[PDB]
Amino acid sequence: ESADLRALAKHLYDSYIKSFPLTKAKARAILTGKTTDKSPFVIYDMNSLMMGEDKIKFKEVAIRIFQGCQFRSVEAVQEITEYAKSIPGFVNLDLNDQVTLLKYGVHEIIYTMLASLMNKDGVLISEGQGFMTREFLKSLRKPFGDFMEPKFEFAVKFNALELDDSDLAIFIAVIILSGDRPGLLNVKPIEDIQDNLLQALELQLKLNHPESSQLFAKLLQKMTDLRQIVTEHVQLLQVIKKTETDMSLHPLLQEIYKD
Amino acid sequence: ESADLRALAKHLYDSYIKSFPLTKAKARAILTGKTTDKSPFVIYDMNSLMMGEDKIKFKHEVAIRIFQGCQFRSVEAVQEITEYAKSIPGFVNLDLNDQVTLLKYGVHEIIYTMLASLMNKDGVLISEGQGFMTREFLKSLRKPFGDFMEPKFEFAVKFNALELDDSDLAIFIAVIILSGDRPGLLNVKPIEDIQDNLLQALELQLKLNHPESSQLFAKLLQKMTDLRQIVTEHVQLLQVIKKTEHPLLQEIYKD
Ligand SMILES: O=C(Nc1ccc(Oc2ncccn2)cc1C(=O)O)c1ccc(Cl)cc1Cl
Ligand SMILES: O=C(Nc1ccc(Oc2ncccn2)cc1C(=O)O)c1ccc(Cl)cc1Cl
Ligand SMILES: *c1ccc([N+](=O)[O-])cc1C(=O)Nc1ccncc1
């Protein structure tokens, strides 16, 4: 029955709100200059970077940004981990598979939600209190500059779809419950949850964006871009973990990089 | 109006069978030896335990392994309780931060209430009721593990003395979730408005379902002293387990 899938969509959306404090709706308000939200300090140089430390409460500039990009990743993973548990059936799976779904789904999800925080010019940081321009980033020291260029590339293509949070909730869910993840012990129960999620996504996309021809198809196709962006970054780290063997990587993030 | 109260009582029971796989009626059937159709594999010592893994297919040190398997069923319960709560009238209309707060502080109290339905004087149904772990085998676990679940056992025999059925626990569970005294709520009025409704239904339900049982309502609300006291003890023993014992799993099982 059509209407049973609406229940699952509203369920996922509700957990998304509960699990992700910086929704895309909050981000697009900050980024357009709405009055529901307040204005961010923008850093495009070492001066504002250093006035950023003063104004923005947070915790070489090229590594200290990265050390900051890192603790934030940890928080996102913890946030996505909390969201997964809410997906019906996920906690009932084999525990080695739950773990394996999180280890591979997390990066594809990080970059999907990072899109919500980007425009063509830059990205909100520190819960929206900050904004870092694409240019300041591409202008960092030789292994750290290119690091964030392709994420900006994907968000432009992805943000084109004009998804809102209620769509992303279900899409995020589909990403976790994949089944072609390597090492999975029982693909079948994963595949039946995802079959249900895609059904829910399909109805959701068609009702929430009724004039958007093949948005479902276009959206599923975007998992190609996510797959590529992740591998590009996994190699990119490997350069840094050995350019600076004096830069330490957070253990949770490391456990999600079996190379 | 009592016809409205019954309506809500039946609403909740229906939702309680939808949400919770192993009902207390079911758990009783297995435990008594009445329904002899499927009888659960029993774990009474180390040898039976190691055979138990090959028959029951758990999805997860023997004592350390049992604790972790207890943790796995914990996050499953949470998700069933969360799904159940949504079906309590007015729950979802609450401030979303208030819902997360009620659930956050209420899942444990509900976990042990419902654990009591799977227990008796000699042990507990485990897995989906296809196991049974004897209490004496749990007592025999290396410290501090062997004394972890012995306090829960004496709550359950006291709790089960009330002889509550699933339709009672349905409403009783609802009352626990709508506790307007949880740390950091934002709008206590609707929470207490629902709870006084839920208490009214519970009251009329106990009286109709147990006219024999004098003041069972009052006896029931007094047990929520034993619940809060169990929980506060339980939080503390898994903190000295935190000094006795990966990272991804550590995130699924956060406190
Ligand atoms: O910089 C990013 N994130 C953060 C970096 C530093 C930080 O803390 C910080 N900020 C400025 C200077 C030092 N540290 C917080 C964040 C965040 O997103 O929360 C970032 C986000 C998206 C992309 Cl594509 C790239 C980056 Cl480099
Ligand atoms: O045994 C219990 N929980 C489980 C522990 C392990 C487990 O899986 C398992 N079984 C045997 C050995 C290791 N792991 C499944 C359960 C369950 O309740 O479903 C249990 C139930 C009630 C109480 Cl008071 C204590 C425990 Cl330890
Ligand atoms: C077992 C082990 C750890 C925790 N905890 O971290 O709070 C809880 C439990 C437990 O009692 N789990 C359980 C719930 C419902 N039915 C059976 C077992």
Author numbering:
A (entry chain A): 207 to 265, 276 to 475
B (entry chain B): 207 to 266, 276 to 460, 466 to 475
Sentences from the paper on this structure:
For BVT.13, the covalent ligand cobinding pose is similar to the orthosteric binding pose. Although these covalent ligands have similar pharmacological functions to orthosteric non-covalent antagonists and inverse agonists, GW9662 and T0070907 function through a different structural mechanism: they slow the rate of exchange between transcriptionally active and repressive conformations natively populated in the apo-LBD, with T0070907 having a more pronounced effect than GW9662.
Peroxisome proliferator-activated receptor γ (PPARγ) is a ligand-regulated nuclear receptor transcription factor that regulates gene expression programs controlling adipogenesis and insulin sensitization. Endogenous PPARγ ligands, which include lipids and fatty acids, bind to an orthosteric pocket within the PPARγ ligand-binding domain (LBD) and function as PPARγ agonists that activate gene programs. GW9662 and T0070907 are covalent ligands originally described as antagonists as they bind via a nucleophilic substitution mechanism to Cys285 located within the orthosteric pocket and were shown to inhibit binding of select reference PPARγ agonists.
